Amino acid sequence: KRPPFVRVPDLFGSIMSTKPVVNPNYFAAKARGDRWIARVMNFNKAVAARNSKVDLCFLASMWAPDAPEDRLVMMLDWNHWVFLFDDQFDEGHLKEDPAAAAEEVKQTIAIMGGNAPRYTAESNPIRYVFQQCWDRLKAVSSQEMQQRWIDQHKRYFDQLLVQVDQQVGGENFTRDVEAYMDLRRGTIGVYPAISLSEYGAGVNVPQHVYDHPSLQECMKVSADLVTLVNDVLSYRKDLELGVDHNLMSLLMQRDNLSAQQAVDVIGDMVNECYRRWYLALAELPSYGEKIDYNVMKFVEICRAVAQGNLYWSFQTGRYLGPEGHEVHETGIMYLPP
Amino acid sequence: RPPFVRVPDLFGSIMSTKPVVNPNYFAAKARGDRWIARVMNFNKAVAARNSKVDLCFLASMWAPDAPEDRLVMMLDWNHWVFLFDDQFDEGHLKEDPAAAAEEVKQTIAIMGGNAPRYTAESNPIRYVFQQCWDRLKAVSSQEMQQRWIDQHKRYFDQLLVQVDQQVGGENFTRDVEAYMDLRRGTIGVYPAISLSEYGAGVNVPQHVYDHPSLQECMKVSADLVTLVNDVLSYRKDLELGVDHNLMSLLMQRDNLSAQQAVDVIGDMVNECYRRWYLALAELPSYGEKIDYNVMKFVEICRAVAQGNLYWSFQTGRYLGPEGHEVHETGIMYLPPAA
Amino acid sequence: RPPFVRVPDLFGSIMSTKPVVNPNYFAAKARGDRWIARVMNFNKAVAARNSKVDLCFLASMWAPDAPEDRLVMMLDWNHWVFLFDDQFDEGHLKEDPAAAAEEVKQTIAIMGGNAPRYTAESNPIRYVFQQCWDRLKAVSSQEMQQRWIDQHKRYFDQLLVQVDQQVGGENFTRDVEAYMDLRRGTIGVYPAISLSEYGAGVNVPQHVYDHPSLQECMKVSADLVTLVNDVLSYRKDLELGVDHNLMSLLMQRDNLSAQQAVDVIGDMVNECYRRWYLALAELPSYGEKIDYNVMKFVEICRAVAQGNLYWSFQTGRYLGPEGHEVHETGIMYLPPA
Amino acid sequence: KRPPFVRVPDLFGSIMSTKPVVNPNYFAAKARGDRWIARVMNFNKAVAARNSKVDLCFLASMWAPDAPEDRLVMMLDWNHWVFLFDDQFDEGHLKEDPAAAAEEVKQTIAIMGGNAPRYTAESNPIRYVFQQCWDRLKAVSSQEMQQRWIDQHKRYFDQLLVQVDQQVGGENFTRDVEAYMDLRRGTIGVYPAISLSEYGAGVNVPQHVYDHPSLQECMKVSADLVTLVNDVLSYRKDLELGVDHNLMSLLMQRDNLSAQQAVDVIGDMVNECYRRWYLALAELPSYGEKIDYNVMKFVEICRAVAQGNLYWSFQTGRYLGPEGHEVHETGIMYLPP
Numbered sequence A, D: 001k002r003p004p005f006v007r008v009p010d011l012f013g014s015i016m017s018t019k020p021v022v023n024p025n026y027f028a029a030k031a032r033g034d035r036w037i038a039r040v041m042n043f044n045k046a047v048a049a050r051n052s053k054v055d056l057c058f059l060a061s062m063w064a065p066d067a068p069e070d071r072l073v074m075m076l077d078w079n080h081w082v083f084l085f086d087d088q089f090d091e092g093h094l095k096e097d098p099a100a101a102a103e104e105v106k107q108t109i110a111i112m113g114g115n116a117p118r119y120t121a122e123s124n125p126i127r128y129v130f131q132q133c134w135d136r137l138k139a140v141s142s143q144e145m146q147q148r149w150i151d152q153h154k155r156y157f158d159q160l161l162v163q164v165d166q167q168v169g170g171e172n173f174t175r176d177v178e179a180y181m182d183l184r185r186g187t188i189g190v191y192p193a194i195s196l197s198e199y200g201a202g203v204n205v206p207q208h209v210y211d212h213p214s215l216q217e218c219m220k221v222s223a224d225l226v227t228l229v230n231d232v233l234s235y236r237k238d239l240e241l242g243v244d245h246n247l248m249s250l251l252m253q254r255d256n257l258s259a260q261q262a263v264d265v266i267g268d269m270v271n272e273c274y275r276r277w278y279l280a281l282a283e284l285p286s287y288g289e290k291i292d293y294n295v296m297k298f299v300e301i302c303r304a305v306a307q308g309n310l311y312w313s314f315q316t317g318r319y320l321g322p323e324g325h326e327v328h329e330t331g332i333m334y335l336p337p
Numbered sequence B: 001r002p003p004f005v006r007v008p009d010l011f012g013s014i015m016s017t018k019p020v021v022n023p024n025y026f027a028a029k030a031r032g033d034r035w036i037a038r039v040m041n042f043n044k045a046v047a048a049r050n051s052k053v054d055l056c057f058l059a060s061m062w063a064p065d066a067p068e069d070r071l072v073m074m075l076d077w078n079h080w081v082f083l084f085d086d087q088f089d090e091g092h093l094k095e096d097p098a099a100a101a102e103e104v105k106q107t108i109a110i111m112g113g114n115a116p117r118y119t120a121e122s123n124p125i126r127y128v129f130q131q132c133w134d135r136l137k138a139v140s141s142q143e144m145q146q147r148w149i150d151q152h153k154r155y156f157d158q159l160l161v162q163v164d165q166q167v168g169g170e171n172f173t174r175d176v177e178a179y180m181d182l183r184r185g186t187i188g189v190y191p192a193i194s195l196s197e198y199g200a201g202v203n204v205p206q207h208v209y210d211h212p213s214l215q216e217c218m219k220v221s222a223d224l225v226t227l228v229n230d231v232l233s234y235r236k237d238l239e240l241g242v243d244h245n246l247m248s249l250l251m252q253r254d255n256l257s258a259q260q261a262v263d264v265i266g267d268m269v270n271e272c273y274r275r276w277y278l279a280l281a282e283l284p285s286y287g288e289k290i291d292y293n294v295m296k297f298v299e300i301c302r303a304v305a306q307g308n309l310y311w312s313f314q315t316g317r318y319l320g321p322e323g324h325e326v327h328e329t330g331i332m333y334l335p336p337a338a
Numbered sequence C: 001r002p003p004f005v006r007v008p009d010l011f012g013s014i015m016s017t018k019p020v021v022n023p024n025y026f027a028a029k030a031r032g033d034r035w036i037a038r039v040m041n042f043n044k045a046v047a048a049r050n051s052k053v054d055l056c057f058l059a060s061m062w063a064p065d066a067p068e069d070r071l072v073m074m075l076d077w078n079h080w081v082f083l084f085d086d087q088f089d090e091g092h093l094k095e096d097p098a099a100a101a102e103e104v105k106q107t108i109a110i111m112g113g114n115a116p117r118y119t120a121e122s123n124p125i126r127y128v129f130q131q132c133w134d135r136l137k138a139v140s141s142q143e144m145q146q147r148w149i150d151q152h153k154r155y156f157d158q159l160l161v162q163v164d165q166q167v168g169g170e171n172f173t174r175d176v177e178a179y180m181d182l183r184r185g186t187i188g189v190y191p192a193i194s195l196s197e198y199g200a201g202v203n204v205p206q207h208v209y210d211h212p213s214l215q216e217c218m219k220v221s222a223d224l225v226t227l228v229n230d231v232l233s234y235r236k237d238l239e240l241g242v243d244h245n246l247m248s249l250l251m252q253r254d255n256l257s258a259q260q261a262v263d264v265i266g267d268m269v270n271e272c273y274r275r276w277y278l279a280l281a282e283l284p285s286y287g288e289k290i291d292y293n294v295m296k297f298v299e300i301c302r303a304v305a306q307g308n309l310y311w312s313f314q315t316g317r318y319l320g321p322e323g324h325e326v327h328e329t330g331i332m333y334l335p336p337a
């Protein structure tokens, strides 16, 4: 279970094997977004550099590679938000507090069109960032696209609360794998990430098309891909910070698997994601050239959120920094004794 | 029968992405168009007409990042495949099994067989194929040289089946599966994928290439091309009296009208897309490095299909400027014919 | 006099880069070629012949990142300009200074004067300029509207001087500097730069634009097109009895052979490259913000000349497929007469 | 003078105003190259990270933006070499040691096809890197190109010995401006950098064209532009590390200029660089299309080496880190008390 290394499945196969396309504005937007998030959070010279080495701009730059600079900056901001946001439910104050967790979720969701107050970086730094994002989204999105951003952020928040229920309910190692995947499909944040990317991309497929089971499964697959990849790469962080929400921990602790057998099962599910993906595009009806052009762009987005995460996962300072390249090159991921 | 028909959307599913066209299109086109005009002795009129066929447009979407050189060889191959195939459709080989199979036997001989050095003077069409083969040979591994042979073979083979059916009175007795089996070969998509693997510089291992899922992808690209072609070149096959067209077969085999035949073709085009993804679902992974190129090869299948699509609406060989109007309006006119 | 001539290298220095061609060329060519054909009532033959003139190629290199609709706009303007200018070279206004003036009057009045809403039916050529001007007006500032007008006026003015020199019998008494003066206007490059500012979305402040440095860049680009055109349009000017060609002028005034005249043209072309660089030497800075667009503007000046260069060697209007051979071999054949 | 902040001249005007193009292989070559120098030099996690923040890949990715991945990695290596090498003569043990400085350039020049040993990371890490770059250069360059490689590096090495001679001979503040620039045209590393770029871009103009005074002057201007830009941005580093090689230090302590009046002189020099650039290009003869095509790519390399340094200077963790983007925005560069 706790061997000196674990042999990682190939995460760069199938639809993940292509050369990632990185937004050419990455450098400009990182410069603006990194410094802005530092002033907002009041990060010091060393905390600001530590965040800058996390490079959330690499992640967003791959999600929406032809986004214009100003929207990529927005994508960066939103990412800093979700990172600062999610950590409150994983390591921060909302981890074992159902009441406060639901109250943060109600307060954050009312930002988007509701009765929330006007936040400032002083009044509530993280809710401000999300609110600065919403305002920009609202200002260049159809009301239907705005509704989609809400409803997808809502799917993330809903699971966050199921996450804190299972946490305090001692369900973290009772829940089966389907229950865990169902939780993470929301708490991974791919569903609002895709909405963010539709904003950056400038792609607005009609809600009826969007709602088709094929495209919903494309989103579901991409969310599974991110979660499988994330639970491998960020496993050491989950050990170092005591977070149980990791499929490797779940498969060892619940099914008596060896760390290596665990990772192996992750590789089985990853490649079974690729099979579901294609099988789901086979059901995708056609809506004529005009719309299908953007449906394809959308399907690319679901792909890009997953591959953008994969490549970002293997080099971000938040997980393994420069050590992730060695794991990429040799499949060997060292563990802590 | 009808003055026009509503053609099905051919630019849906995967065909709907914005095509990429090789930036070298212009310089490769000015060279290779002049070249084939010298080889074939095209007077000004016939050479201008051939440029308006714009096979360079076709090649420029099969391999959009092919370098100028390889792109010129590709234009060379397409001018070959068109002058060659016409011999079997309207030319001297259309009703001549013996003369067809001697032509096939002598063209195959060019790819390493006992073939002589052809010249533009001695044999102009066989010459172009030799020039392509020379260039293919000098930058390809032996496994890809073979693949190129084996894929041309699949095309050459159905050529001979096509001429047997033609003389054998089978043209309108063959059922739709028999026809598509035939056109999968005679459409030339299999040799075109080998031509593009050359242009794009993608050399997938043969044990991978041979997997039934990639095979099915080559097969779907072929059906897509045969389907789109039959609907576009339909006026040509009428004007020139060629029976090898799913429209004429659906109308003369089953009693469907023009509209219903083209509707059937639309259904089949969308069944292609379903078969595409269902095939991709069975494609296994060979690790990052190979899968990377596998992905490039799948794209080559798509780009052949999509390159044919956009070209078929542009080419003067079919509808010329009125193919743009068919893309704009869905209306494809038919001749009075009586 | 000779069976051919050796043309100097017209593709050196700033002309020697690989041209960038708007990747919307095909989609734009399809629309605009068809469009002008309906307007001018071209029949199958004339329409295809005009399609082989491929003004879309020419426009696609002036503004290689113009969106499809501005490219079509530029194609329409090119089709205009060629129809329009031909009235002055071999058409009716060729020898008529009254009718020529009236035409120049009526056309200028399209641009916010008292011109009637033309129609393909009433006046096709004027219909095309007016369809252009409407599009130029809707997306350009009032300053750029004036600049478009003002630049076309330089073109129109020399047209009137042209008809004055045809009727005045000074087509071969005039000198080269007088001829270059005229052609700098009649060549149409000044409004073609205005068209390109529209196409490429570049809006340099007028006090910058008016700096002698930038005006000499336009002068140079216009000279390049004129020298290049006179070499490649030479066979046409012989076919259609047009006297406006430096080739023809150099042989009458100076007792120059065809070869040494084209060689003078090569000598002048390389002088443009030196005037180009000398003029940029004099170009002040207005800070990164503006300088970024002046640099695009200088490129637009370069792209009109270079686009003209490649189009001149491909178009069916001049040498068609033979032009490619003159670029491969430097030999241009001349008519036996 | 010693103000609290200086207003830096607009460093991004003229030919520096274009949007810089950054090699898409930036992300892959960086991940390779950063880890590689980390291993070679035994950097620890924090030293490695600080080197990643130097982001020397960003600097090379702008020198040859279409260089394939493997050549970009080489370029990164060379840059890691150049910095580790150049600091030995600025802050290191060779800063004041004429005999050992000459022995270093003698041991290093002999790596390029001479009687040098086969270095390894362990025996001599920095010389090992230069050796690895040189083996790659030789493998894919012509003899003439390799000789150019050697001759441009010798220009760097020679001036390094002049720098150490002036340091110890107490001439650091006696040498006039021209002496200083003539020294830095060598020690700034631009000449070998252009050479490194000819390799990365695959551009091999012939030496008879290369030696033309126009192109030699183009390289000079590139060299001055980096020196000027360097002395401005690396002024705080020179203060903090006690290095007298900086035009700002010279102007103040040699003449009578304040630290503000110093940058002012940089600003006039920087814009005079632009003037010289165009005057040299005016004198550049044409060598026919085929050659001129590559000459312009080379003139671009000259420009790109400067413009690459410019953007990298304002991002590097080596100079101002995050505060450089503020100095780009505002033109205010704070100094220590």
Ligand SMILES: CC[N+](CC)(CC)Cc1ccccc1
Pocket: A082, A083, A086, A087, A187, A188, A189, A190, A193, A226, A230, A305, A309
């Ligand atoms: C829960 C969000 N997440 C998951 C790794 C960490 C804060 C970032 C993320 C969001 C969207 C897509 C991919 C990653």
Ligand SMILES: CC[N+](CC)(CC)Cc1ccccc1
Pocket: B081, B082, B085, B186, B187, B188, B189, B192, B225, B229, B304, B308
């Ligand atoms: C018979 C080959 N074909 C089919 C339309 C006509 C000459 C050209 C072609 C070859 C390969 C792919 C697409 C078209």
Ligand SMILES: CC[N+](CC)(CC)Cc1ccccc1
Pocket: C081, C082, C085, C086, C186, C187, C188, C189, C190, C192, C225, C229, C304, C308
């Ligand atoms: C206006 C005359 N000209 C010159 C060849 C032919 C009709 C068009 C033109 C205008 C501007 C740039 C390039 C060509």
Ligand SMILES: CC[N+](CC)(CC)Cc1ccccc1
Pocket: D082, D083, D084, D086, D087, D187, D188, D189, D190, D193, D226, D230, D305, D309
């Ligand atoms: C000595 C040169 N420098 C900064 C001027 C320090 C290592 C790197 C550099 C090399 C080449 C071009 C630009 C910067």
Ligand SMILES: [Mg+2]
Pocket: A086, A089, A090, A187, A188
């Ligand atoms: Mg979480």
Ligand SMILES: [Mg+2]
Pocket: A086, A087, A090, A091, A243
């Ligand atoms: Mg977490």
Ligand SMILES: [Mg+2]
Pocket: A230, A231, A234, A235, A238
């Ligand atoms: Mg995690």
Ligand SMILES: [Mg+2]
Pocket: B085, B086, B088, B089, B186
């Ligand atoms: Mg056929």
Ligand SMILES: [Mg+2]
Pocket: B085, B086, B089, B242
């Ligand atoms: Mg046929």
Ligand SMILES: [Mg+2]
Pocket: B229, B230, B233, B234, B237, B245
């Ligand atoms: Mg057909």
Ligand SMILES: [Mg+2]
Pocket: C085, C086, C089
């Ligand atoms: Mg004319």
Ligand SMILES: [Mg+2]
Pocket: C085, C089, C186, C187, C244
């Ligand atoms: Mg004229």
Ligand SMILES: [Mg+2]
Pocket: C229, C230, C233, C234, C237
């Ligand atoms: Mg002319």
Ligand SMILES: [Mg+2]
Pocket: D086, D087, D090, D091
């Ligand atoms: Mg130093």
Ligand SMILES: [Mg+2]
Pocket: D086, D090, D187, D188
């Ligand atoms: Mg130094």
Ligand SMILES: [Mg+2]
Pocket: D230, D231, D234, D235, D237, D238, D245, D246
């Ligand atoms: Mg310094």
